[PDB]
Amino acid sequence: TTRRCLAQMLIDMEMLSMPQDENCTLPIYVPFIEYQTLSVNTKSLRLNSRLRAIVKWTDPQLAWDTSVYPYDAVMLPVDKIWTPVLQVKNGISTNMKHDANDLLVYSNGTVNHEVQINAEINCEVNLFNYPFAGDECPVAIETFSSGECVTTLILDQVRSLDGSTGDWQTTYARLKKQREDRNFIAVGLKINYSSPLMTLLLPTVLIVLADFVSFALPLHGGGRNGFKVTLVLSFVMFLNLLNSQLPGNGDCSPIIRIHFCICLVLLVLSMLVSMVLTRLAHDGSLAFFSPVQMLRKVVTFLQRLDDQKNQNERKHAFADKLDKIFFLFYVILGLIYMCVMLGIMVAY
Amino acid sequence: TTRRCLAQMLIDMEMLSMPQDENCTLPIYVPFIEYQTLSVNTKSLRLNSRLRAIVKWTDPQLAWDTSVYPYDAVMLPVDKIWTPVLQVKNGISTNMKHDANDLLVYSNGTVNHEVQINAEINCEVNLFNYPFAGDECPVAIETFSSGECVTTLILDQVRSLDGSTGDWQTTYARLKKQREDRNFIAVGLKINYSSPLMTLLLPTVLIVLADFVSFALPLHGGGRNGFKVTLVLSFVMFLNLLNSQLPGNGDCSPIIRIHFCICLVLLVLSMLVSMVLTRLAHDGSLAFFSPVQMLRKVVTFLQRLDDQKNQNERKHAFADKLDKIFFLFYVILGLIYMCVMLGIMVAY
Amino acid sequence: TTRRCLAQMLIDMEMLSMPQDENCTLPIYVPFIEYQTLSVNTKSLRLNSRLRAIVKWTDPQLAWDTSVYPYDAVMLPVDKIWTPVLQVKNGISTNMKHDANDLLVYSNGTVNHEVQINAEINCEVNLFNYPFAGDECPVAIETFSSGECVTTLILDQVRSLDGSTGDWQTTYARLKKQREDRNFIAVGLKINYSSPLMTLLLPTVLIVLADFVSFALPLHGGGRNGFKVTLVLSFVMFLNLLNSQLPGNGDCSPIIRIHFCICLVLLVLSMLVSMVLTRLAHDGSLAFFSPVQMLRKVVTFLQRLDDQKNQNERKHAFADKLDKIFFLFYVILGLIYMCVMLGIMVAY
Amino acid sequence: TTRRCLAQMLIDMEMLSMPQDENCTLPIYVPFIEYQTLSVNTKSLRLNSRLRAIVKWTDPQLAWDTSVYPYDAVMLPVDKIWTPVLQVKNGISTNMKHDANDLLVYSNGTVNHEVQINAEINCEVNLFNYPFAGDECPVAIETFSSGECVTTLILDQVRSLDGSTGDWQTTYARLKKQREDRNFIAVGLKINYSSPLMTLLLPTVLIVLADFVSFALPLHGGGRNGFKVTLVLSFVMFLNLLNSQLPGNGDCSPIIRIHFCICLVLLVLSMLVSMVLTRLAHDGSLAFFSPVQMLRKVVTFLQRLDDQKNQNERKHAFADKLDKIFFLFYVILGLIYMCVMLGIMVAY
Amino acid sequence: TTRRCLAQMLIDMEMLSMPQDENCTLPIYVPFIEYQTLSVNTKSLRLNSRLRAIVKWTDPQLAWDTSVYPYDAVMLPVDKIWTPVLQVKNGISTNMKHDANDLLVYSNGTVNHEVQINAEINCEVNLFNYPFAGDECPVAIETFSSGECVTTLILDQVRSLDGSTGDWQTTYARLKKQREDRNFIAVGLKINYSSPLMTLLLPTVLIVLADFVSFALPLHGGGRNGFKVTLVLSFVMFLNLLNSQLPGNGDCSPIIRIHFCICLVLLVLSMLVSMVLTRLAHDGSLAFFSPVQMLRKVVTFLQRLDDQKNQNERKHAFADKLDKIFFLFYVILGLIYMCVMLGIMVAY
Ligand SMILES: *[C@@H]1O[C@H](CO)[C@@H](O)[C@H](O)[C@H]1NC(C)=O
Ligand SMILES: *[C@@H]1O[C@H](CO)[C@@H](O)[C@H](O)[C@H]1NC(C)=O
Ligand SMILES: *[C@@H]1O[C@H](CO)[C@@H](O)[C@H](O)[C@H]1NC(C)=O
């Protein structure tokens, strides 16, 4: 008649099979399921989530008589009775773990048990606009149901421990329904653009801006072609860095990969013409690629030196005119593309 | 009547249900719980801690008669009797393991058992001032308690194996109480600023300082615009390196990220004007961006060469005046910002 | 006579041995096996796959009488009866996990159970043309069969959750047959060349293109040998980066590794001749490596200075002729190799 | 009477409790415990070790009569009898695993069993002199002992599989005793300085040596300030690389961190003065930072050009004198510090 | 009399102890053990291998009478009978896993069971010549044998799935014998030298050759010391990269590290002497480190300029001669050293 004696009696029954007496239909109630994201992967688009629920079903066999046993509750080990296994069918690698080794059983057979579910969900989000991205990620909650025997799951409330897990920030977790009366949790994911804008977008804009004014450096004075080659080799690192944390899957892929690619060609073309124009300034034409006697003598030499100075001046100004013509065309075209490229990344 | 015979008799009872006879209230005593930090993550703000405790509860069923059995203690396997499962409810991924496979049981039912708890706590610390940061991290210790059945947990002492786990240094571990009589361990975390100051802050200050005096290099002599472009590309690496180990979550985010961001723009602007001023020195105006006969002839040539030298001197001094004006404005503004920027990071 | 009572009776039978009564031949039916790739490794050529199947066999012992028990189905725990263990014999590290802890048993002995198989397959794909690569990867599904006792596996349908897992894209998963009536799944793997072309191939082409026109820089003006050394040191990084994600196994290894290797030698050879030609321009020969009185005096000095200018001009044009001769030979040879090397990588 | 029948009889006894009949004091003999280090972490100062022991205790209950059973030994599964669990109390994450699933039991109750213990020890070593470092690391071996019941452990011999695990080399493993008769293994750890000296110390010495003679480059000729800025940006990488594998805990921290820090300031100061002296050479003062008629005319111009040459010479020599004065002061101070700094790192 | 009834009868016997009736000597036959390497570590010299064997022993108790039971084979679960645990004693972290959950038992007691063994072997290979390295790696296979009870293991055939696992290529796996009749598998490991050569040795040789030819650059023209300092920084990066993936244990350590160190010292010395000679050319001596009137006046000025030009020419030619002498000596010594070191790395 002791409460522990009552607990021992229920264990000796060994009711390790589900309560399927009533048409093999078990309504399992899961009120106040708590959601939390542990980490979100950007390259693999995988979301790791933790689900802490409070399962509550009915076990008719685990119900004693309140007259012989004057008690209203008793707690038994989880492995001595049947316990449902909640699953996340939408994602991969779902695992359910018992929060505690004991569960509460009431006098009428109702069983209270809390579980913790860790699952990895292959999240699909429109990453066309990195970093300005965000999409709803469905997380399904299901229990085994085969053929005639079905165990419907009833969800009541969802509370989310919202907070950034890194680059991604979780905004909400709402309860919705699927087509065939399937309960799933709609998780809202957003990217904090404070970090990607400063580390990737701003240096890219500043580097391209430095290239536009890099034409101010005179061709003869030097420090221009070497100045531009460092800018170009900096975008090669940007392409490798950017590609290491972004999925180039297919349609609606991140456009910043295309934007970086176009800038690399634009900077290479800018260096290409400057290198050619340097030869034009030094040589005067683009053919490298294609296959009283004493007092009068000094006057002849002095005018010859002046003519040598004059031909240097004229050959160094014709190349400047081509450089000025290209600079006007390049900066307008570059600024037009930069505004258009950025405008697509925020409003398309 | 043998002690081993007594031990085998207790195992044959199979008391795998908790001692809930007395109103289903089990006071579990946990004196001298020892705490230690294994590692602390800065980017994800996660703290890994190990908790070695000595659980001590009362099992009335596991109590023999000292007359028939003249013994005062006996040790049984942990899996043959009921053992409480201590949890860390505040954090994620809590797991309790048995230090040994045996536990001591006294003649009056008292059971002595030591457990080791490994938990991962999502620590919230004000990282606004990196590296000068530190905050108290709560670690909760709880046992299962559902509905009527409650198992209050009594804690006595906490001893911390204080010591740096890397960048973070653990200072203390004090015992406090929550609102609903919940025992939690208050952990003090501090960042050793010896490392971050030397590896990140000092090179940043020196690079900006070298930029201020980089204006001493003459525009005509060269080695200035190329000198500055290496400094600018160094801060791009600093932004990427710094962003890889700091959480850009939201309000009260690390301000060194903004401080590095401002310095990058300042160096770019300094290089931008220098390239423009170089064109002014070489060209004389900012229009590139906008769309006795023998003895007397030698005098005319000689004065012409002198005039060519004079016009070079005057155009190379007007650009110097603009460079000097900018240097006075830039170095004063830069030093004012640097002192103000650093002052916020230590006293705000 | 209760359904739960029927379930308890079947558990008490303890039928943990396989149904081998009929000639020890168990036909195990596995309809609608679902395939999905979790990740594909390029360097180690290992494919990680998840297999979700619905096993369905016959257990004659687990069949009750529908007259005494008026029920058509019942669910028992998976660990209380015998369950086949599906294997992936082709690959390493195969592990089978039960999706749920319950399985459905019909009145005639048929048992329905769904399993999840995670295996790591050593995939062999012709990676001669990176990125343009793709090959069929066999995945075998087998059940234990030793000596006389054989358990044939019957497969009906395969449905694949096709989608890129990173650099690799899964295209299909078809059901085929091996020699000895062995069922295996043919998995089609393809590499999305959008990423590898942009991050590796395009910068390589642009760098080599910049080297071809780098000969436009005059030898005397400077900024050429230093310009080329940055290009060569950039290819050293490309070799190390490319080698870190590609297997250099043997025959039909990635040819881009050889293509990068040839480009490094070609760019080095271009720098070697340019540095030698710089000495020729400055010195005039390749021997460094080998072991009225007042009015008439000024005329002698003036003609001497003119002759010094003339000898500088003639020695600076002879080196230009050798540079022009090499440039014509180098660009045609470089363009011919670049087109030929790329042509092999796409159509061989 | 069969040996297997005798083995089955001992299993049927189910003696899963410890042999505590004799005053609950069990002398457990562990001769020839073998030690081996798997890996040593330098940044976290954690040592991973493997311990292969041969446990040998006495079980009086597991002793048969040699008359009825004419056998002297028998092997039983480890899980059918009681087996002690050896622990490493000094370190974290201690786990004991059975080498085999069988153990030898003699006719008198003696049981022979070999176990493998993997533990992670928080090693404290004086890393003030990196790489020239080495200290004794204690590894404690303990068995559960609570209250009255104590199981003393007897250790006889220790044999170590000495060998380098990477940067650290294991030298010995000796058996010592603690205060309260506690057995612990003293492990000697040494750092092979062949690797750290070559990868870090030698380039640092060579870079600083190159800076000392970098003053040989003339200020006017160029190639000096740009030469020094590459040296300084190289020490920024050294600080970050060295900080990534060294614990900056507190007192007696690696002094090479400070040595690198001092060298960075020294190189920055060397570049700082050179940039200022370059302005002095070009300008002549440090004020930038602070706020017969035909035949006689040619003589006036010629002497004017000579005077312009003379003033350039005098202003280019005054700055040389300051550069020479600084070079003498800098190279003696640098060599004095370098010899003193290295002397502390080897003999302090 | 049913086959499943026979299996149930054999399971109910509970023969979980070894067949030790006959002198406690169990001959365990393991024919056709299959070997495969999963990965080989170069820095830690650890080999990961997988062993798939077919164990076959004799269990006299598990033998029925063919008259009462007209069957020749039956399959039982692996956990219901005794199964040997094969071990890899030579290496660390040995773990045996059952391929399937069923094993075949014949009418005469013979039991057939296949196991998979994963072990990590501390491989010792002579890495003096990287990448041209290769050595035989022993892998021991053993079963528990303590005191009187010995279970000899008989091996018949070894088949290896040879194939490169990365940088290392497995060549063979032959069966040999140890001193005390111990069976071990001799594994041949070879390094595919194409990848390490192309990634490390060729760039090093090209850089050294570029340094050798860089003496062609004139001292006055500039662009020489920056070239050499970039080469030296690249070689420092090479040293760090090479040290990051090679074990510097002791005697017979990789000599490529010493080769890189010597080459770095040679490059630093070349840069040092180049800077000293540049100072000598600029100054004329190594002392920086050590502590008719109108018509006649013009003639005096011109001869002064001529003398200045002549003294500049001579002070440049003396330094050119010294540079030529050092270039000859350095190129001869460097070629000799390179040939000697390559010969040592290839054939020593
Ligand atoms: C069983 O009793 C509990 C305790 O109050 C109650 O919450 C639950 O609704 C009851 N269920 C039924 C089916 O009566
Ligand atoms: C049980 O006995 C132990 C042994 O001294 C003692 O510490 C404990 O307080 C006792 N508990 C009770 C409830 O008597
Ligand atoms: C057993 O019954 C199920 C239920 O319809 C059926 O699908 C299956 O084919 C039956 N098997 C046999 C062998 O009759």
Ligand SMILES: *[C@@H]1O[C@H](CO)[C@@H](O)[C@H](O)[C@H]1NC(C)=O
């Ligand atoms: C038990 O027998 C073994 C077998 O020789 C022996 O080594 C051991 O010392 C004996 N122990 C006792 C307590 O007699």
Ligand SMILES: *[C@@H]1O[C@H](CO)[C@@H](O)[C@H](O)[C@H]1NC(C)=O
């Ligand atoms: C037992 O029978 C099997 C089946 O053919 C045979 O391979 C094996 O050699 C037999 N062993 C003995 C000891 O007779």
